[PDB]
Amino acid sequence: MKNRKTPMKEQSPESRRRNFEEVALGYTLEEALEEAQRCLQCPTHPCVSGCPVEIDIPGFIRKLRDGKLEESYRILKSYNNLPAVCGRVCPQEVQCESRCVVGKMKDSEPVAIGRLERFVADWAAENLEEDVKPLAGSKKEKVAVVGSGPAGLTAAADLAKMGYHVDIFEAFHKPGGVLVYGIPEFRLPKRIVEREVSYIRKLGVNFHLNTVVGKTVKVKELLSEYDAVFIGTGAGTPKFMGIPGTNLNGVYSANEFLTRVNLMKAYLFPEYDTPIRVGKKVAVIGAGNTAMDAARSALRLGAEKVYIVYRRTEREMPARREEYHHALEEGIEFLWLTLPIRYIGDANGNVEAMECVRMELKEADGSGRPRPVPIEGSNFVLEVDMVIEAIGQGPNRVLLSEFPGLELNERGYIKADEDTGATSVKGVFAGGDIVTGAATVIKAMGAGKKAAQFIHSYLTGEWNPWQK
């Protein structure tokens, strides 16, 4: 009666609980080919409607079936700049695979499009490469890309292919944005990010690392010396709930936790010089992927119990299903409809507890997800030696203020044309999380590709959005 996805090799739960190695190990060729056979090749291909950049899914599946693997990769790459990333991190359960027909069947799972995108992208990685020849510097004109996330990498790459001088500006010592300091190694191996950056390096894109724009170099210089500019800085500014005890030792922003853990590799100590605080009972506040990574990371650091604390339920939770399952398999505990009210510490220095309540289904939506209303008398406590806040984060409003005439939305994100990415300032484009608020990698990728195309349309004089 059932029709399931072809199972993939995964790390053993007991062994993988302690390490940061990738958990989903990837398809073998035969497993991939066996999965590719489940695709029914629907002429109307609803799957494609669930992909934000509209990848020709049955096509690359077809050429995979046929054994023409490069052709498959070529089909993928004409749409997605970062397939090995997206096939790994896309929440296909709310995207491409949620429209898949084979899942419409009773007791039947959809085609594993993501695992296949991954397989094809990975298979081509440890096998072939391309021509090392740089393409940048043919169109003589200068475009600056600020931020080296999916958006900036994508725009830069695509622009270098278009012949332009591409100079990337990055604040950190490593490029990749969230792909380097946010999402952990056990989800996204960094060999892939380094690979893609290197690829983009060989295109003649020059990276300015450890470069914080507005400080290292003034916005005015960037505007004066460059024909166009793309802003892909994301929404990385942390916010704290602001309840009492936010200032206790053991209390962290997920930004800081994950920055120490992922970028500074504080789990590798004293090999790497960055330390990380001990906690056996840690609380991670949030139910995003941020919370899940922070929790799953804290667990790997040798914590005994790890709690997810969420003001909403399992069916509102914005986390990737595969990773939530992994999280459960690794022993993460979940508190549905739970909201902290204060953190409590001891004589010397410590978090020792957290006061929480239970919520109600009353209020309808009203931003967020349906506004939970606190219930009285349900008030309780969780004993914790470490707290991590994964409640989300907002845009670098400061850097934005340094752009004159650059219009922001109600929440402070940039206003830019949905299709072209052009903003109110002349010659300045923008895309990724800095515009939409926190979304997906694929959307930052897409935003960068379109912005690049309209940078091309702009620097050739075909299309000009800025007049009096």
Partner 1 sequence: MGGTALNEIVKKVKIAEDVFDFWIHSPSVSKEARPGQFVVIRLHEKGERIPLTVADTKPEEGLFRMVVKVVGKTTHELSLKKEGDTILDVVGPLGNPSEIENYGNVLLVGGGVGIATLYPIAKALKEAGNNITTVLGARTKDYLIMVDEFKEISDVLLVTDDGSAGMKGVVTDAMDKLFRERKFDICWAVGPTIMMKFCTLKAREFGVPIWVSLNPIMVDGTGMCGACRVTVSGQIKFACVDGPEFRGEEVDWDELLKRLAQYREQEKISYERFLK
Query: In the Cβ-directed half-sphere of 299, how many Cα atoms lie within 13 Å?
Result: 29
Residue at token pair 């270098």: 160
The CB-of-294 to partner 1 minimum distance in angstroms stands at: 12
- Single out the residue of 42, 53, 217, 243 in contact with partner 1 (rule: CB under 8 A): 217
Q: Give me the helices (H) in 274-386, please.
A: 289-300, 321-329
Q: Which residue is nearest to ligand SF4 (CB)?
A: 47
Q: Provide the sign of the torsion angle of the four alpha carbons 266, 269, 273, 275, taken in this order.
A: positive
Q: Is 229 helix (H, G, I), strand (E, B) or coil?
A: strand
Pick between residue 32 and residue 399 the one whose CB is nearest to ligand FAD: 399
| Residue that the structure tokens 């602001």 belong to | 242
Build a one-symbol-per-residue string for 184-223: x at contacts with ligand FAD by CB under 6 A, - elsewhere: ---------------------------xxxx---------
Interface pick for partner 1 out of 216, 401, 409, 464 (rule CB under 8 A): 216
According to CB under 6 A, which residues from 11 to 70 bind ligand FAD?
A: none
Q: Say which amino acid occupies 23.
A: V
Binding residue for partner 1, selected from 81, 259, 290, 436, defined by CB under 8 A: 259
Measure the CA–CA gap between 262 and 254, rounded to whole angstroms: 11
In sequence order, the 6+-apart residues with CB closer than 8 A to the CB of 457 are 420, 463
Distance in Å, CB of 464 to partner 1, minimum: 33
Nearer to ligand FAD, 231 or 359 (CB): 231
**Residue 245 near partner 1 by CB under 8 A:** no
Q: Does residue 177 belong to the site contacting partner 1 (CB under 8 A)?
A: no
List 6, 72, 95, 233, residue binding ligand SF4 (CB under 6 A): 95
Give the one residue of 197, 399, 422, 451 binding ligand FAD; rule: CB under 6 A: 399
CB of 448 to ligand FAD, least distance (A): 7
**Does residue number 98 form part of the binding site for partner 1 (CB under 8 A)?**
no
Helix, strand, coil percentages (3-state) for the chain, rounded to 5, are 35, 20, 50
> Which range touches ligand SF4 (CB under 6 A), out of 4-12, 106-114, 210-218, 396-404?
106-114
Binds ligand SF4 by CB under 6 A, chosen from 90, 162, 285, 452: 90
290 binds ligand FAD (CB under 6 A): yes
**Binders of partner 1: how many residues, by CB under 8 A?**
35
Q: At what angle do helices 289-300 and 321-329 cross, to 10 degrees?
A: 30
Q: Is 269 in the site for ligand FAD (CB under 6 A)?
A: no
Residue 218 engages partner 1 in binding (rule: CB under 8 A): yes
Structure tokens at 394: 């907002």
277 contacts partner 1 (rule: CB under 8 A): yes
Applying CB under 6 A, what is the total number of residues that bind ligand FAD? 42
Nearest C-alpha neighbor of 75 from the set 103, 109, 113, 20: 113
3-state per-residue secondary structure call for 203-222? CCCEEECCCCECCCECHHHH
Residue 289 within binding range of ligand FAD, rule CB under 6 A: yes
Strand partners of residue 230: 145, 429
CB of 278 to partner 1, least distance (A): 9
Length in residues, the chain? 468
Could you tell me which of 431, 416, 412 has the C-alpha nearest to residue 465? 416
Distance CA 89, CA 178 (A): 12
Find the radius of gyration of the CA atoms of the chain: 23
Contact pattern from residue 400 through residue 439 relative to ligand SF4, giving x for each residue in contact according to CB under 6 A and a dash for the rest = ----------------------------------------
Return all residues near 55 (Cβ < 8 A) that are at least 6 apart. 48, 76, 79, 80, 96, 117
The stretch among 70-78, 98-106, 242-250, 436-444 that binds ligand FAD (CB under 6 A) is 436-444
- Measured CA to CA, the distance from residue 1 to residue 156 in angstroms comes to 49
Q: Which of 72, 81, 148, 297 binds ligand FAD (CB under 6 A)?
A: 148
Give the C-alpha separation, 145 to 430, whole Å: 9
Q: Based on the shown chain and the rule CB under 6 A, indicate whether residue 298 belongs to the binding site for ligand SF4.
A: no
Q: Tokens standing for 171? A: 């604040």
The interface with ligand FAD within residues 303-332 (CB under 6 A) comprises 320
SS3 380: strand
Packing angle, helices 57-66 and 69-77, rounded to 10: 170
Distance CA 218, CA 223 (A): 9
Structure tokens that stand for 356 in this block? 């929480």
Per-position x/- string for 35-74, each x denoting binding to ligand SF4 as judged by CB under 6 A, each - no binding: ----xx-x--xxx---x-x-x-xx----------------
Residue from 43, 50, 312 nearest 59 by CA: 43
- Closest approach of partner 1 to the CB of residue 212, in Å: 6
Contacts with partner 1, residue ranges (CB under 8 A): 171-173, 209-210, 212, 215-218, 236-238, 240, 242, 246-247, 249, 253, 255-256, 259-260, 264, 269-275, 277, 349, 396, 398
Contacts with ligand FAD, residue ranges (CB under 6 A): 89-90, 146-152, 169-172, 177-178, 182-183, 211-214, 232-234, 236, 258, 273, 289-290, 293, 320, 396, 399, 432-434, 438-442, 444
